[PDB]
């Protein structure tokens, strides 16, 4: 419950739907396959945690920190995630459909083929993130800065881009994608 | 008529309606406001032609040479430019709406504040042109070569560009024209 300290704990496969764990310090936690859909995770500390085949749709994750944590492979189906800090979290082939993530950290983040489906990632930071592979349909990255990330062609005809910060050479990409040759 | 030697000739305010001026050599002709809608000027020699005001609206000018050509505020609605030669014309204020330039050579061309709306410029080359002011609604520029070309913004969120070879540079105005910060 509220504000425990459980890190370190032994969590997988633990089923804690719906679980108040607001301001919970779960650090370095096991909690790969836990059910943890719809639980409240407000501001919770779960910096290097192990979420890896987690289910945590329609879980409230608001300003919770996730930097380094293992969430590949996770359901954060209608999560919301606006201002959780999730730098260097490995987000591989998560499913992020209908996420906020606005204002988000995802500096260094791995996103690669994570479901980015109607994801709103407005004022989210995303420099030196991975997205290859990402589907980016409907996806909102509004303000977004994604200086140094790694994105396919595909994402520039697909994600929302308005005030997006980009690179050079993500500036030439973003023209190559829309048919213009450089050749 | 028809391969008639009109060179340095004085037409201006001619009527030459429909004429048939099939490889006609007008080099350096004066023609400045002549009326010569839907002539047919195929594969004329227009060098160095004075066409300022000209009403060429419906006319036929393909294979034309009209290279350092005088056309500035000409009328060429609907007119036939197909593989016309218009390296360094003048065209600041003509008006080219609907008109056909598939494959014409406008290197170093001007077309200020010219109106390009649903002109077919496919092919065409455009280096070193100068497109400031001009109105790009509906205009066709696929496979067109933009290198080295002034543009506005707008142009760029107007005009279809599939193929259209750029600068770098143009590559970075065409994702800050879609609303990119490269700031």
């Known amino acids: 419950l509220t504000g425990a300290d459980l890190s370190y704990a032994n969590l997988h496969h633990a089923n804690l739907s719906r679980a108040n764990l607001r301001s919970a310090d779960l650090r370095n936690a096991n909690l790969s396959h836990a059910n943890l859909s719809g639980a409240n995770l407000e501001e919770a500390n779960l910096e290097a945690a192990n979420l890896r085949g987690a289910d945590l749709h329609e879980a409230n994750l608001s300003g919770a920190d ?69 589907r980016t349909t409907g996806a909102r990255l509004d303000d977004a800065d994604l200086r140094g990330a790694t994105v396919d062609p595909v ?23 829309h048919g213009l040759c450089l050749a």
Chains 1, 2 share one sequence.
């Open 66 to 134: 996730l930097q380094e944590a293992n969430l590949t492979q996770a359901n954060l189906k209608d999560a919301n995630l606006s201002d959780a800090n999730l730098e260097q979290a490995d987000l591989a082939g998560a499913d992020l459909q209908g996420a906020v993530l606005d204002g988000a950290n995802l500096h260094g983040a791995n996103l690669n083929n994570a479901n980015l489906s109607e994801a709103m990632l407005t004022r989210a930071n995303l420099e030196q993130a991975d997205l290859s592979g990402a």
């Open 155 to 177: 994402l520039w005809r697909t994600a929302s881009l308005v005030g997006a910060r980009v690179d050079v050479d993500q500036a030439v990409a973003f023209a190559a994608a």
